[PDB]
Design a protein around this ligand. Sequence first.
Ligand SMILES: [Zn+2]
Lengths: 43, 123, 112, 56
Amino acid sequence: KRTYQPNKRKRQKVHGFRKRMSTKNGRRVLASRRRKGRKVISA
Amino acid sequence: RKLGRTSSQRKAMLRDITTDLIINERIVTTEARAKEVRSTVEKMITLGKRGDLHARRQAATFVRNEVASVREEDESIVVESALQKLFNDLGPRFAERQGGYTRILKTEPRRGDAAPMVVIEFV
Amino acid sequence: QITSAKATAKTVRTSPRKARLVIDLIRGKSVADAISILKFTPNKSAGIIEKVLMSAVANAENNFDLDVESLVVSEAFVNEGPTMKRFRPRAKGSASPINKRTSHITVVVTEK
Amino acid sequence: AVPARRTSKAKKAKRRTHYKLTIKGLNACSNCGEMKKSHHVCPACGHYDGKDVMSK
RNA sequence: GUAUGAGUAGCGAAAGACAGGUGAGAAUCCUGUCCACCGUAUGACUAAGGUUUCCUGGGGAAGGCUCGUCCGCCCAGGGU
RNA sequence: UAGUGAACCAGUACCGUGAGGGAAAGGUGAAAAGCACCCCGGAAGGGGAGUGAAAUAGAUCCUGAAACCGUGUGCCUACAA
RNA sequence: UUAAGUGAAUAAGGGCGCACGGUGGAUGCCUUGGCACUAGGAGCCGAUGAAGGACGGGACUAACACCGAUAUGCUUUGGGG
Ligand SMILES: [Zn+2]
């Protein structure tokens, strides 16, 4: 067993969007990426 | 002897090559396979001159069981089973001939393996 | 008034070393020996340089010369083309590159 | 183990005096004069001992 | 960017043979015949996971540890 | 190889589940007038003939150094540490 | 004729010089992008739905830009020919 075993749920109920619009730290994450101009905001 | 492959694969190879030339009379293969075909086939046509039951019940081993060779019909379909061609056709050709029933020629090497190649006929 | 037509081949997928072995066997020899020598070698660089000699003879016919029966290979070159580069996954994580080379081949056919 | 130093340009060449390709015997045809290998079937002719074999 | 070692190491566990095809070209592609290997599985259905590789007709510059007329590769058209 | 990381479809391709980390890449000619036609070859590639003042300016396209790989030849070398 | 003595040249390959090619892009020259500032404007946008985005719009649509089911755009007022 090596590591990166994917799921379609868990990579959107941890690293999604709605769990970065839930705190005052996901908002730091999104506004820190928008000042990099990156296309993919979050997975 | 000449070692070519594993132990009990030479039996299968020399059965399977030498049921050709019973059918075709031409084979385009390499050097060493042809020399073992020399030895085995000229041991086999000598059984083609007895016609006994020992001629059947020893040639039945080293020839494939199956193999069709069908070129005759008038109002029939007659099927030579490629052992019957020893005892009906290949036998009584060389009945006055002694040993030396084969010819080996030297053509070319192969395209991808550089293996020099060889034709075999009978007469 | 010129003898000595030419013909080249560019970026042919072989080595530069192995092609210099066949061209050891062609300098100084006539055309009649050369095609006969090239027919009976089992190498990749055998069947390539034949096309170069036949195109050089065809240049010498349809452009300048005559006298096919008196043509001599005078010059023969093997040069280094651009080299393709790939990688191979070697054990314990790392890798090691692989050069893949090509060559430029020119052959000159003079009369005498 | 591991080579001690670079071999120079001289010992590149002084090895390779035994890395030659050569061609062994070539003979004319029976019937055309074209160069063909001894003890071998003629590819451009089909003849051997002045007799065509590669035919039906 | 290019050497050196060096045309050395290696080509990643296994049984193939012949005849006839298309082709510029064939151990490697297509067809035929025999032989051989697994068979609580190298066989059938599905859940994740992958995201067009599935199908048809073409092509051979690169990928395929060799070749390659072939391909899960490229072109173009379609299928849930 | 400077100047923003980025003169070019760059916070891109790529790497890590994630926060994140982050490249190489400009120039034919004045104008595409970018080689009709013939020949070898399956093609690529080439040789003529043409355009162009110039093709050793032919799409890897101004100039083209060095390591490196080749061809031909004036002189020397097979009792030498 | 015999004896005694002296004895050059040839290169499987190699070294040095010259001459001619190939691989590679240093240097020479150039601007389409930068850097640091100067004078002035401006120093907010949002429940009338913002910033940033997803999906779609062309005869041909893979991308960029522009736009929005009125979708490569509509109305009006001046300039322009
Ligand atoms: Zn002949």
